[PDB]
Design an enzyme around this catalytic site. Structure first.
Site, short mmCIF file in Angstrom:
data_model
loop_
_atom_site.label_atom_id
_atom_site.label_comp_id
_atom_site.label_asym_id
_atom_site.label_seq_id
_atom_site.Cartn_x
_atom_site.Cartn_y
_atom_site.Cartn_z
N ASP A 200 0.88 -1.16 0.00
CA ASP A 200 0.00 0.00 0.00
C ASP A 200 0.94 1.24 0.00
O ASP A 200 2.13 1.11 0.30
CB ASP A 200 -0.90 -0.03 1.25
CG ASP A 200 -1.95 1.05 1.35
OD1 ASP A 200 -2.24 1.71 0.30
OD2 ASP A 200 -2.49 1.26 2.46
N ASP B 168 0.04 4.83 1.47
CA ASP B 168 -0.20 5.50 2.75
C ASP B 168 -0.09 4.54 3.93
O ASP B 168 -0.78 3.52 3.97
CB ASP B 168 -1.56 6.20 2.75
CG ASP B 168 -1.65 7.42 3.65
OD1 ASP B 168 -0.75 8.29 3.56
OD2 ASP B 168 -2.64 7.53 4.40
N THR C 233 -2.84 1.19 -4.41
CA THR C 233 -3.23 2.30 -3.57
C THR C 233 -4.60 2.90 -3.89
O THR C 233 -4.96 3.05 -5.06
CB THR C 233 -2.13 3.40 -3.60
OG1 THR C 233 -2.54 4.54 -2.82
CG2 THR C 233 -1.78 3.86 -5.03
N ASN C 234 -5.28 3.35 -2.81
CA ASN C 234 -6.52 4.12 -2.90
C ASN C 234 -6.05 5.55 -2.97
O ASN C 234 -5.46 6.03 -2.01
CB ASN C 234 -7.45 3.91 -1.69
CG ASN C 234 -8.36 2.71 -1.79
OD1 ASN C 234 -8.41 2.01 -2.81
ND2 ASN C 234 -9.08 2.42 -0.73
N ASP D 187 -1.88 -1.13 6.01
CA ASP D 187 -1.99 -0.60 7.37
C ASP D 187 -3.46 -0.59 7.86
O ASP D 187 -3.71 -0.35 9.05
CB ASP D 187 -1.37 0.81 7.47
CG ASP D 187 -2.07 1.88 6.65
OD1 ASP D 187 -2.45 1.59 5.50
OD2 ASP D 187 -2.20 3.02 7.15
N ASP E 198 38.93 11.12 -14.44
CA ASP E 198 40.09 10.69 -15.23
C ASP E 198 40.38 11.69 -16.37
O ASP E 198 40.60 12.85 -16.07
CB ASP E 198 39.97 9.19 -15.64
CG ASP E 198 41.14 8.64 -16.42
OD1 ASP E 198 42.16 8.31 -15.79
OD2 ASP E 198 41.06 8.59 -17.67
N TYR F 289 53.16 3.88 -18.65
CA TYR F 289 52.18 3.25 -19.55
C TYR F 289 51.71 4.25 -20.67
O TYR F 289 51.19 3.81 -21.70
CB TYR F 289 50.96 2.73 -18.74
CG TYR F 289 50.13 3.85 -18.16
CD1 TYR F 289 49.10 4.45 -18.89
CD2 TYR F 289 50.42 4.38 -16.91
CE1 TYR F 289 48.40 5.54 -18.40
CE2 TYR F 289 49.72 5.47 -16.40
CZ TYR F 289 48.71 6.05 -17.15
OH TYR F 289 48.03 7.12 -16.63
N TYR G 31 45.62 10.57 -25.45
CA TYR G 31 47.02 10.55 -24.96
C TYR G 31 48.03 11.01 -26.01
O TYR G 31 49.20 11.24 -25.69
CB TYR G 31 47.41 9.11 -24.58
CG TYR G 31 46.69 8.53 -23.39
CD1 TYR G 31 47.19 8.68 -22.10
CD2 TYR G 31 45.54 7.75 -23.56
CE1 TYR G 31 46.56 8.09 -21.00
CE2 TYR G 31 44.90 7.16 -22.48
CZ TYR G 31 45.41 7.34 -21.20
OH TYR G 31 44.74 6.79 -20.14
N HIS H 233 40.99 3.68 -8.48
CA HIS H 233 40.85 4.55 -9.65
C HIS H 233 39.42 4.67 -10.20
O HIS H 233 39.08 5.70 -10.77
CB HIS H 233 41.79 4.09 -10.78
CG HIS H 233 41.64 4.92 -12.03
ND1 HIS H 233 42.17 6.20 -12.12
CD2 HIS H 233 40.95 4.66 -13.15
CE1 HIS H 233 41.81 6.64 -13.30
NE2 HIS H 233 41.08 5.75 -13.96
C1 LIG Z 1 47.24 14.66 -18.14
S1 LIG Z 1 46.43 13.95 -16.67
O1 LIG Z 1 47.37 13.83 -15.61
O2 LIG Z 1 45.17 14.56 -16.46
N1 LIG Z 1 46.07 12.39 -17.16
C2 LIG Z 1 44.78 12.11 -17.85
C3 LIG Z 1 44.10 10.88 -17.23
C4 LIG Z 1 45.09 9.71 -17.25
N2 LIG Z 1 44.41 8.48 -16.80
C5 LIG Z 1 44.82 7.23 -17.11
O3 LIG Z 1 45.81 7.11 -17.81
N3 LIG Z 1 44.11 6.16 -16.65
C6 LIG Z 1 44.39 4.71 -16.79
C7 LIG Z 1 43.07 3.91 -16.54
C8 LIG Z 1 43.35 2.37 -16.52
C9 LIG Z 1 44.38 2.02 -15.41
C10 LIG Z 1 45.70 2.80 -15.68
C11 LIG Z 1 46.27 2.39 -17.07
C12 LIG Z 1 45.25 2.72 -18.18
C13 LIG Z 1 43.94 1.94 -17.89
C14 LIG Z 1 44.93 4.25 -18.18
C15 LIG Z 1 45.42 4.33 -15.69
C16 LIG Z 1 46.32 10.04 -16.38
C17 LIG Z 1 47.03 11.29 -16.95
#
Ligand SMILES: CS(=O)(=O)N1CCC(NC(=O)N[C@]23C[C@H]4C[C@H](C[C@H](C4)C2)C3)CC1
Ligand SMILES: CS(=O)(=O)N1CCC(NC(=O)N[C@]23C[C@H]4C[C@H](C[C@H](C4)C2)C3)CC1
EC number: 3.3.2.10
Lengths: 546, 546
Positions: A8, A10, A122-123, A184, A334, A382, A465, A523
């Site tokens: 219900d 109310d 409900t009513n 109720d 990110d 990376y 990137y 992250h």
């Molecule tokens: C220029 S920054 O500092 O703003 N920047 C942008 C965002 C970036 N983020 C990033 O690289 N993230 C990941 C997300 C996963 C985990 C790890 C490796 C791969 C896959 C890229 C970080 C770091 C540098």
């Protein structure tokens, strides 16, 4: 065996009950006990309240009829109604005071999650009051958590008439013995019992939930804190804007109020904000969750320079222009967090407020190459692997399920070591072929990302990137500026790439900067700690963004 | 020969100029003549104002620097600045007071309509003030009427530096002799002249426009009242919501503020509101222009009952649910006008306000068949022709261009006689094969409707007429109700089907009803009299809908 739960509104899903207000009014005005409740139910099935509950008349049409019943009742009880007695006032106040009984909704949510068909019976009335929006908002929030909402005023039948029960059973496609019914009002519970349904007389919620868990064999009481509401992609409003001839931007939209633009990171989706979209909408905001350029349903051109910050930001301004938005609050995570700081630096007039999860604001070094800068930080290694067009794409596109299962992991589940990614020749070189499912994600949620990435792959996302020198040159133009608009920096304790200490010097460039901090968060902030992300964002939005 | 027109913002497209405010402040505070204007330009190209105009610093960073220049200036002039002298206050007031110079914009609109490339070249700043939104709104309204907007603070160059002129010419893809340049500052006009551009020193708008029309050979002054801004389908945000498994609803969305849902008639499109979409957005509303079920990009199921008012209304409620909207104002025309009165009767809590163009609200007669009722009115005879599935489809689908050219006509251009449509065996039996183009529509606008109707045809649209008994039964449930929410009835003088007199008894069911009336207006209200539709709707929205 049970397969359906009926609630219900109310006194069950919404507290306090309206019946409890008529009683409280009598006590407050020193009126004879039950006088108001008696006038409310005057004439029974032939009375004005039945006509109202069946949808024959609207609430505004009912107010004068209730007033006559109250005058008639006071005449018989040999009493006088006070100088400024108002039914409109009593009901406006009652309706406004009524809030969702959260533990009842939680139990309904759990039964639905365990396979039950859930329904609201409900009513109710057709509300045409100047202040009807409050109730409309309540019903909106509630109804989406249920399979069915049955309203007396829409079906022209009323509790306790036996036909509404037979109507309920027909919409449930269930026999009485398969149904729990919570009410109720004892009288309204009686026909469900007579039909063979499991019934619960709800007085206090705790006892009702004890009866409910005992009868279903599902833990509903003392349960762990639940996750916020998520999104079902197919139930969302999907928007599309052409920002230039070969570029279209996709977004998911929910709620009314100030526009809040959500900007995801790498390699993500609008869906990375699934736990924030319903929460922010519920908090009084119009959410626009983006598929950033190169992702999902947005265009993914192949050219590297289509992904430099200058074009990405210009296209986000155009996105606002075409939607007819003079401003939006920009919330990023990110790579989205970086875009968002750049939107505030280059287009402050278009940014109502700016917030970043994990991503700090670090001004460009005019004396050093961004290449030199990235080599100076071993966690940023990376990024060199991501430079060569094709190398990272091939590895990331090889097995989509593996990619998202390997990446989307909580701080205590890591499978990746970002130091010596180039040396080892890849992100997943020491990762299993079949990674386990992280506690943050379901198999279905991973398969959403897999389907999204099947359209355009990783070229467009990796190209974010590939614009270091271009972004550095453009950013150097803003070295004399300061971010003076409202701003929020949210740090995540266990993000080993975007470490909280990287944000330490931010007040030199953002003096009025506000902060948030999440303990035991990796992250993937939004899905790692959704409840706390929503709490920080909502508190900052209501204080600094309107 | 000229092919491009360039306009300054301050003192040209926007009045009054900021320069005129510093002068007025001096006069009001009894300060030495030019004191403020002198401090504003202190240090020239090396000064703080140049740094601000080039984008080196933001407006908030500039305020203290202007204050120091003002103190320095008063020190030399041997005078004192008043007790509560504030640059922030002076500039907030100046910026807020500045409005679009409408006849200048009109002339720019006309030059663009006659083939010119139009551009805004302005010396401006990066605005980070708490009140920056006003200026953002101004720029938004202005920029969409031009091919290019060149802002000094974004390009890092400033008038009168020669490079910005060479930059202007490069973006125009035009030689100097092909360009008119309008400016209120003689010094900033000088480099354009030196390059060989046609220049206009703008003091008063009238004289400037005389010079402009004399030089272009295009009438810009004393021109007829222009049409409101229309929509280019490809420049809109397109939204999609699944309301049920086989039904998706399409809409176009523009603006921020209270949600205004636009509902078209038969046989139309979201595009029938093209002249209202920009106007209502500009007036402070979030416009949602629908493709109704069976039309354009919305689903068109074949079944007749999918088009009864009960399902159409339920689906519109679901549309609100999925978008996260507790309410919207519902504005309808023709069949959309009927839906909209039914949304107010069955779901008042979801309707902020209701408005209808041409379509009156007439309660169902419980003593008579809707078939009997339609036969009682000879103008409603074409509705009997629409009953037989396939007959009207075949005629309407035969030649799409012919269909829209024959239907979409002003009150003095009629080609159709709706009396004896059944007898004659069709709507276009006495209509030409190649109808002329009505004054209301261009060839391109007809071809938009032709392309839309190629997807699903006329089955779904005609099915709206095929639910009389079903709609009558459902409507009979609401016979005891009244529409007590805010409501607007707009009548059209020359609509010979939906005649104004058909609306005469509306206050018996809608006591607080507000009215609008359009002289010399046919059935196609929105495109027939757009300016007056917008004026009535905006005045009613700001008064009754917020
Ligand atoms: C220029 S920054 O500092 O703003 N920047 C942008 C965002 C970036 N983020 C990033 O690289 N993230 C990941 C997300 C996963 C985990 C790890 C490796 C791969 C896959 C890229 C970080 C770091 C540098
Ligand atoms: C039930 S009602 O009175 O609300 N109603 C719905 C709208 C309908 N409108 C309508 O039929 N319009 C058209 C539009 C053009 C011109 C003429 C014939 C044909 C093509 C249908 C009227 C009239 C009856």
């Amino acid at each position: 065996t049970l397969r359906a739960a009926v609630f219900d509104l109310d006194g069950v899903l919404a507290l306090p009950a309206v019946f409890g207000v008529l009683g409280r009014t009598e006590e407050a005005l020193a009126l004879p006990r039950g006088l108001l409740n008696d006038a409310f139910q005057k004439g029974g099935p032939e009375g004005a309240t039945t006509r109202l509950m069946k949808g024959e008349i609207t609430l505004s049409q009912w107010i004068p009829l209730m007033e006559e019943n109250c005058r008639k009742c006071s005449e018989t009880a040999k009493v006088c109604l006070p100088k400024n007695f108002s039914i409109k006032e009593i009901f406006d106040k009652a309706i406004s005071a009524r809030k969702i009984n959260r533990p009842m909704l939680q139990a309904a949510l759990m039964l639905r999650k365990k396979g039950f068909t859930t329904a609201i019976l409900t009513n109710t009335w057709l509300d045409d009051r100047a202040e009807r929006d409050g109730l409309a908002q309540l019903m909106c929030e509630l109804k989406m958590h249920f399979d069915f909402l049955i309203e007396s005023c829409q079906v022209g039948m009323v509790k306790p008439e036996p036909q509404i029960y037979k109507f309920l059973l027909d919409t449930l496609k269930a026999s009485p013995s398969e149904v729990v019914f919570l009410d109720d009002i004892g009288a309204n519970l009686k026909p469900a019992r007579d039909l063979g349904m499991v019934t619960i007389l709800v007085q206090d919620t705790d006892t009702a939930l004890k009866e409910l868990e005992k009868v279903t064999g599902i833990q509903l009481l003392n349960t762990p804190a639940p996750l916020p509401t998520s999104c079902n992609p197919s139930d969302m409003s999907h928007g599309y804007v052409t920002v230039k001839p070969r570029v279209r931007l996709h977004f998911v939209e929910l709620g009314s109020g100030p526009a809040v633009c959500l900007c995801h990171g790498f390699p993500e989706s609008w869906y990375s904000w699934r736990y924030q979209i319903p929460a922010l909408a519920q908090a009084g905001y119009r959410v626009l969750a983006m598929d950033m350029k190169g992702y999902g349903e947005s265009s993914a051109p192949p050219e590297i320079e289509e992904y430099c910050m200058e074009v990405l930001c210009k296209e986000m301004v155009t996105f606002l222009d075409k939607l007819g938005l003079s401003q939006a609050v920009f919330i990023g995570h990110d790579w989205g967090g970086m875009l968002v700081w750049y939107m505030a630096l280059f287009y402050p007039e278009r940014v109502r407020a700016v917030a970043s999860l994990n991503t700090p604001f670090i001004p460009a070094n005019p004396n050093m190459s961004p290449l030199e800068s990235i080599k100076a930080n071993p966690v940023f290694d990376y990024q060199l692997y991501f430079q060569e067009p094709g190398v990272a794409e091939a590895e990331l596109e090889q097995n989509l399920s593996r990619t998202f299962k390997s990446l989307f992991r909580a701080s205590d589940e890591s499978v990746l070591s970002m130091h010596k990614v180039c040396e080892a020749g890849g992100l997943f070189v020491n990762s299993p072929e079949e990674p386990s499912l992280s506690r943050m994600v379901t198999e279905e949620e991973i398969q959403f990302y897999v389907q999204q990435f099947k359209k355009s792959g990783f070229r467009g996302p990796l190209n974010w990137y590939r614009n270091m020198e271009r972004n550095w040159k453009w950013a150097c133009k803003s070295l004399g500026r300061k971010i003076l608009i409202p701003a929020l920096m949210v740090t995540a304790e266990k993000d080993f790439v975007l470490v909280p200490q990287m944000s330490q010097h931010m007040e030199d460039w953002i003096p009025h900067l506000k902060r948030g901090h999440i303990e035991d968060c990796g992250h993937w902030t939004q899905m790692d700690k959704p409840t706390e992300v929503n709490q920080i964002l909502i508190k900052w939005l209501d204080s600094d963004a309107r």
